[PDB]
Design a protein around this ligand. Sequence first.
Ligand code: HEM
Ligand code: HEM
Ligand code: HEM
Ligand code: HEM
Lengths: 146, 146, 141, 141
Amino acid sequence: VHWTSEEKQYITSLWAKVNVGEVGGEALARLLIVYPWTQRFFASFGNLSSANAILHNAKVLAHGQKVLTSFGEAVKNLDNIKKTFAQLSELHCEKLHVDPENFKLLGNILIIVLATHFPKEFTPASQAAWTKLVNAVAHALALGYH
Amino acid sequence: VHWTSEEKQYITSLWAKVNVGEVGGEALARLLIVYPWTQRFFASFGNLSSANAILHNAKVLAHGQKVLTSFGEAVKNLDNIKKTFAQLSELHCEKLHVDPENFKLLGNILIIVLATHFPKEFTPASQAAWTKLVNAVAHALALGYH
Amino acid sequence: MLTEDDKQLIQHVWEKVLEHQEDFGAEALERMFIVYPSTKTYFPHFDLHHDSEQIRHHGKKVVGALGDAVKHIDNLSATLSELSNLHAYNLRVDPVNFKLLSHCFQVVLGAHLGREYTPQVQVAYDKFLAAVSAVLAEKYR
Amino acid sequence: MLTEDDKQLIQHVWEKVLEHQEDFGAEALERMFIVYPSTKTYFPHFDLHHDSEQIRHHGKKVVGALGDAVKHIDNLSATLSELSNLHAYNLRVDPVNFKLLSHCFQVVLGAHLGREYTPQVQVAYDKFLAAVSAVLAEKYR
Ligand code: HEM
Ligand code: HEM
Ligand code: HEM
Ligand code: HEM
């Protein structure tokens, strides 16, 4: 990509205030609830039979924390995202066979979650930078297919 | 990408038999007919008011020939596609503002057209190689956005 | 399909939107224009500066149409017929863009409701906005 | 929507398909498995070698269902209700894959009709397959 000082600042400044556990659990729960076919990949996670069950699922929440921690690795090294996710790209593509379209859906969910958590700071400009971020992460993970 | 000898052969051997003018006109006409919103980008092309009008539109046919000739530049240099289309990427993204999803739709149309023209040679294996090709071209053109 | 629960969650959030149709609409549009600049090419006749008169008035119109959609949720196709012909035949709007505006509208809702934009409310609006989008693009199929 | 012309073009092509349901179905499935290998993970219980008994029998079932869809084209949701529950609730099929199989089916049609798979026939089948796909995934919305 091509990061401007302003974009990097919108990303790092907001991330420093992010409750990774809360935001991560929210993002994954919403993925499973809003796009139910994604539950196919989490059979070992136990009860996912309802939105309430998903929101109270310890494994879903813990996994969401690990996923957002991963996004954090993109935030911490904005110019080397493709490289940082090469490993995870192989996992999701070669091992799990997750269609790349879902990487974009999760990214969209994260944008909405960030908006619910930072109403004043998540301006259109901030959204633009963060959308560029989630898209870069999705692109990096999809490389294991292209 | 990562081209195997077998894939390169499926591509070069079939392309050598391709009537670029016919296949190109067919691909573009089908894009405009099957996905009508794409007509937005061809206002200067005259009458596109019906499938028959589109199929008899000289400019649509001529433009399709130029587009398939472009695909030919990918076929002729399979290991340097990203580079070959960098220029066109700027045109479609920065100048024309064509959403990248349409690059994939055109690629899909080309696959179907090739199947109608080469029933015996377009085996599932041949299709796999050609799909890898149109996707690589679409990916290269979309880089002007990422 | 949209359940009775979905409809109630939608209506509860919607009565807040109707109080500031211009503000909400303009914010959704501006986020789309800034985050997805390609969409700006559909509005060359508009002054696209922040809070321009054209953006605010159009924002209100968009919200008004969504409001009508909320009312006749069981009769979407018929209710938005004029608008579906407009977006498909006149404007030739790429279907992908309906998803972009829908997403931006959800961001506006999230920012304004905060804690209250729960996963259940998100599902309800995702279903609703997706249904509206399908209708606005049905003249392509 | 599907016009009377679309339906006639569809039926003309379809009576040929019904003569070799197994062959057509198996070819569409095999192209999907080879071109989009990720889809193979939905069939771990199947021997996926070329022309396997499981691929041919399932191919016939898929074509049979599409055939029923052709018959009750005005009542799709109701006609495919059992199958929509199956693909959404039991199989959890990713919506993207319906588009992949639809595309592969079109390739099979193109290969078998050659010159006769005109842009008009393609439009008709694209509309038809898209409608069927929307129904098979409607339990997600
Ligand atoms: C594009 C954003 C995504 C990122 C950054 C991401 C990151 C990760 C990471 C870091 C792990 C390893 C967890 C660990 O260390 O235990 C993981 C696992 C996994 N991911 Fe993702 N992921 C993403 C999207 C998705 C999507 C869209 C799906 C499918 C709906 C998915 C399905 C899975 C599955 C099934 C696992 C295995 C975990 C287990 O079995 O416990 N991921 N992901
Ligand atoms: C991804 C496959 C595509 C390739 C390889 C491609 C290639 C090209 C090339 C080489 C030109 C320049 C023609 C010349 O030399 O005069 C061109 C022009 C153009 N393309 Fe594409 N294109 C693709 C897809 C698309 C799509 C999907 C659209 C939108 C639906 C589009 C819209 C246009 C437009 C509007 C022009 C300008 C031509 C004019 O004004 O006469 N292209 N393309
Ligand atoms: C939530 C989905 C959408 C709804 C409900 C909607 C609704 C409307 C309505 C009601 C109008 C007419 C306003 C009037 O009569 O003054 C309109 C106009 C228009 N829309 Fe949309 N729209 C939607 C999405 C889009 C998208 C995605 C685009 C493209 C990015 C778009 C581009 C336009 C344009 C260019 C006009 C002309 C307005 C003018 O010239 O003032 N719309 N829309
Ligand atoms: C053209 C759209 C589709 C139609 C009409 C369709 C139709 C059907 C039908 C009728 C069955 C039941 C066969 C029986 O009763 O023996 C079935 C089963 C199944 N389908 Fe689909 N299907 C479609 C798309 C897909 C897609 C896209 C996938 C995923 C890649 C998929 C995966 C499956 C699986 C795993 C089964 C279980 C079959 C078995 O165990 O034998 N289907 N489908």
